[PDB]
Design a protein around this ligand. Structure first.
Ligand SMILES: [Ca+2]
Ligand SMILES: [Ca+2]
Ligand SMILES: [Ca+2]
Ligand SMILES: [Ca+2]
Ligand SMILES: [Ca+2]
Ligand SMILES: [Ca+2]
Ligand SMILES: [Ca+2]
Ligand SMILES: [Ca+2]
Ligand SMILES: [Cl-]
Ligand SMILES: [Cl-]
Ligand SMILES: [Cl-]
Ligand SMILES: [Co+2]
Ligand SMILES: [Co+2]
Ligand SMILES: [Co+2]
Ligand SMILES: [Co+2]
Ligand SMILES: [Co+2]
Ligand SMILES: [Co+2]
Ligand SMILES: [Co+2]
Ligand SMILES: [Co+2]
Ligand SMILES: [Co+2]
Ligand SMILES: [Co+2]
Ligand SMILES: [Co+2]
Ligand SMILES: [Co+2]
Lengths: 151, 151, 151, 150, 151, 150, 150, 150, 151, 152, 152, 152
């Protein structure tokens, strides 16, 4: 992803798939902890939606063309989805969120570097704010799971 | 509309005892999850109160006379109460809220059928709306307990 | 602290029945002043429930087991309930609320004296605050009835 | 076709009911003014809510709502009289009760016509409005020392 | 209630795609009226997201398993997406939304009928409430476009 | 007396003005519907505010306000025509402009008469409403590519 | 006498009216208490607003408001008597009307005096206070079954 | 004396305190005006709260609150002097401090009497009011570069 | 109405410059009282902006052409600006705001008088509201400085 | 501790400062199931402690006292002991530590209640009483989470 | 010393003051279809401009500088040109004027970012970056309304 | 990899705990004209300082660190010094000692910015920059009250 526009568009696809995964987690969750983690998936979705909309409209702003179909989202995203399954444990659900969040953090880091090289300081700030917040969530999720954040 | 009026009053007694059970759960609750489920019982209590007041006033509106004494509630209710017990687990407190809810969901279907058979479309709606919500609570409570809703 | 605990539990019983009586009044009310006094019963029921929840909790906090079934409330309450009746006038309904409140205020005095004698200053403060407020309500209700508070 | 017709009728009758509530609001005198005067405001707002919901359902369905005082006045089954300060509180409220009984009946006819046409959306609008008007009948009737008598 | 379940899942699919289409419209919009219609797409998206969650959740409550991957949304949906294009006119964007919305309303009617037949009154109301609001939107969008609703 | 008379005239004209704004709200079609449709709602709330404040000023002065649709359309100098979807947005807005120009002239007559009779309270009521309707005329006219032409 | 004079007069009279409204609020007994008791709070608050506004207009103008009970009591044209629970609701309201009628008259004087002096700010302050007090008289009188009779 | 008597004495003195705080509010001049002028409003409001509560407790116990400026002025142990713009900020805050010291000692009196009587509700009112007043004394004194010296 | 129009436009010019002067006071202020008076300038400026907007729009409403460039404000306003100076005292800064306010108050009386005679009552009321507030501010600023208002 | 109201107020200032520090440690070092509810709950406990601290300290100043107001003064005068943060502590052990601190605070407040009562400082007395009431309520809820009676 | 950071902040003060005058003119003198949306939209933009002006001016003060604070300094130091108000300018032309002022502000903010980056004034650097980010989004939006790409 | 960023974050945890304790003393011991405004202003300062402490400690936890979490740790690692509370300090002096603290914090935040930039920790770098921006604005205002330029 050799420039700002490219990694912004990659983030548009990855964020769209992350949203979909978070929604599955929300829906298929069963086990002690549902009542706290089910609405928490709403908060994560709303935040993922905020990045999605901000990164897409930064891309538009720069002269680019955001991915904007489910097809383009699936094809371009590096995240893989699987069928919903009620028998997944809470720990496994939260671990899956952590993995998605680690991927997104690493994508925002790439986004940060690329935009830093090109002198696109606005795009740079957008990836940094998003990175900061995702990393904080990794700490909390990991701590729920009895672990160090291990960034 | 004798039957619609009768099931409305049945609900008044059952909602009164359901309220009393939820208060017992809320008070005698002990175990991991207390801090989430104790205030959650207040929320369920507020919603129950809401049905009670609405169904009771629908009864008065139709020229009936709501049950309005603890004796009437207890005698007329199909719900049975037991002495408060601190030694009940959280899981089993929750499962008992589920049984009460499954009861109410059934009663509200009866109320729906009866009112639909009498062409009391207003009472019909009241039962439907209340049924919709209790059923959603049944899904969530069951999810916490690692089970399907099994309506 | 057996006596403090005992009177807290008496209040749980009496407040549950007081709430049931106010609800009756609220529903069976008819006559000029209905539009102001019907919603006013909601306000009183809300205050009563606040007292109910705070006193039971304090009892739980003290190592006790509050009454938590309709039977327990009805058997232990000194208050008596009669079938709802639409023919009772507005002023009769108010007078019956005054009686209930007069009983609650006297009960809360006994709560105050007993906890004071036992040195349970937290419980003592709870009765005092509840008593202040009920007595204010006696004044207002009597004033509507054209009478002195007559505490 | 007929559900369109009951929706338009409601438009006419809600516009007249609003004018009547406003009269009661203005001409009211006697014990209870302070509570019943602003109550007529809450009534007019709820009435206005129905009116706007129903004309818009009519437009949505391809209709042409009444939208002139002549159309309202001529198509409504409710009659107005000149404002009179001398009416008692109890009679004002009884007048409102009667307006409300009429609207509860019209909302019923509304429910039945759309139910037969299978206009389920219009069916629900009539059901929701009927529910609230009947609750109001209970309370007004209660103020007046009477049973609801629907 | 197999057909109610199956119609809820179809909605899940079509709402997910309708949301994607509204998002594309939001992003790719150019021309007089942008300032009003661009944020208006967000309102519609929120409303769509509401149906999505209520419907998906009702399916779960009924013992179903909702589509929860982009692949499932894309392949089960009757709606079809095209690549984003800035050169479309405002008027063409709005008509595109009208067509998506006409589809949704008809889909909701199917859901209402199927659920009425099975006696699942709860799902029945959900479709009816959603149908009402989408129809209201069709009126407004058509009005902006100088046409009657033509339901 | 003249103040009473013009307050009453306003009650009738504001009632009819409210009916016309509603029709414009409902029958509007064309580019700009999405901004002007809810905007008619704001105009109607403002008109209702004047309606109820002038009417209550009249009652307060010992008068008896018009309070039936009959009285409203008999006393109002505004003309209502049937609702017509094929009217243009710019034509609907020009129609609101006329009604407002009329109301603003009426509120001037109310200002004048109340000032001559010594009724400073009623005088402010007219002045406040005139200020606001005229502000609205500027904006409407500016949307139409025109000067206020007050 | 002059703008400063009638503002200071209003200061003394508002302080005394405040005190009287407090009396009614406290000794009220009879059907209607539950509505009229808190209504007296609304009136007192409104009175305090006039009070504050007029004193500080007096200070702004170079004057020196009465700021002792001796001053309010000796300069006020209103008369206080001892509280009494045996006064009925009907009678309590009548006294409030009397106070408000006095205040409306005071405010007319303030209007005429400030208008002749060209002090338009004070003029507005008196006009706004009067407008509100007169509305309250209509409502109070209407609870009492009477016309406002300004 | 008894709880009823000191409550009524509190009614007297709070009324007068309020009158004095109003004077400080109005007549204030000097550096710090902008912070201290609205601060007097906060204090007045808090004083009004004690007044209303203590008065209604009196009524509730079956007493009869002072309710005329005459009774307030006579029964209060606080002395009023004429408003004067020439007092310093430091002198103004000193006057307020002495009113508060007085009130806090009165509330101690009410506390002591009510405790002996066993009227625990009245006791609480006095204790709550005393708590807040003494906190105000600390802050006032600190602004003045002094210890609270209660 | 040519004179009402001329005084509204004078006010547009004088308010623009008064705003500029208040911003200077806000920025360059030093000395005891900064913490209260610094944010107070903001309140004054927001008040000044409100008059600016209302008077300019009344002029538009009347058929006029408001000054709308820095050159026009500066050449038309009777108020003179000097360069920012940190060394001015708090008491000197407040005195300056007093003199600006005295001018505005006089300008608003002049606006009242011309509009009162010209029959334009709307413009008249705007000047009167604004004069009322500015005069109260004069009282308060003067009191701060230990002086009578001296209007 | 022990002389008068002024002295127990100041003992509270010191013990509340340390209690705050312990809760912050629990908030930070917390790991395990329940983190998502109990991590933010620590913030609530901390806000409430801070409210006692301020109110008590300011009551002291109001009485003519000089509150402790350095870390050294807090840590030397307080009966609470702090240990180094440790992530391996279980959640149930974390909550059990909060209960101990709260049990200590309740006992401190009862002593403050008594002392101030003995001197007739009734304003101070109510401060201690209000604070004790809510801490005891928290001991109830915390213990309940831990499957225990409050055991005051 | 940050000489050039201070100087670009002052250039921003003068340019923001003039930008504010121009949006106000567009606001007052606007006529044509879209008035009802774009007239209040100018108020939003003006508020945003005033925020930048106040932040950039108070950063400059904070650094020991001396902000422009008279109309004369604003008009003489600003690179932006004002012309007389004219009701006969179309909507599209007004929006174009705004787009032009915004292109300029974004180029000035870019210069502010670059200069402060070089002098190690990271705080000033973030102020210019935040303002730029937002101005650029508006240019996208305004251009879209005009049927154009943003062409940053 | 991030050792130096971790160490400065933790330094800030200690310094901010001490800064909070000093603002508290200033809040409590303050006397003289301007008390009514500067007393509550310390609460605003205290809440802002708590926000940095919490965010910086959690950033430390997030990177794999172990934040200081005891008064002893705060006292021993902080470079700030505390003295006994004293009512006879003047307002200007109290205000000057807050400025001293804020100058220290601003320089700590600059160091943290620098170290985190050097290690490529852009998230940490931003936290210090935001904190610095705000602390420096307060120095400006406090100095202005004291009749001085900011002197950063
Ligand atoms: Ca499982
Ligand atoms: Ca684990
Ligand atoms: Ca009866
Ligand atoms: Ca195009
Ligand atoms: Ca004269
Ligand atoms: Ca100097
Ligand atoms: Ca362990
Ligand atoms: Ca157990
Ligand atoms: Cl358990
Ligand atoms: Cl013109
Ligand atoms: Cl002087
Ligand atoms: Co967007
Ligand atoms: Co009810
Ligand atoms: Co509870
Ligand atoms: Co509408
Ligand atoms: Co959901
Ligand atoms: Co009205
Ligand atoms: Co004042
Ligand atoms: Co009261
Ligand atoms: Co404007
Ligand atoms: Co404090
Ligand atoms: Co500023
Ligand atoms: Co935290």
């Amino acid at each position: 992803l050799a420039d700002s526009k490219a990694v912004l568009n990659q983030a548009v696809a990855d964020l769209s798939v992350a949203h979909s995964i978070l929604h599955q987690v929300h829906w298929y969750m069963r086990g002690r902890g549902f009542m706290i983690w089910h609405p928490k998936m709403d908060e994560y979705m709303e935040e993922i939606d905020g990045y999605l909309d901000e990164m897409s409209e930064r891309l538009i702003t720069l002269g680019g063309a955001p991915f904007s179909t489910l097809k383009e989202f699936s094809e371009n995203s590096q995240l893989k989805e699987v069928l919903g399954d009620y028998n997944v444990t809470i720990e496994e659900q939260l671990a899956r969120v952590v993995e998605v969040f680690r991927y997104l953090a690493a994508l925002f880091q790439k986004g940060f570097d690329v935009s830093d090289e090109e002198g696109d300081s606005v795009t740079n700030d957008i990836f940094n704010v998003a990175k900061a917040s995702i990393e904080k969530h990794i700490w909390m999720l990991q701590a729920e799971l009895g672990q160090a954040p291990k960034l």
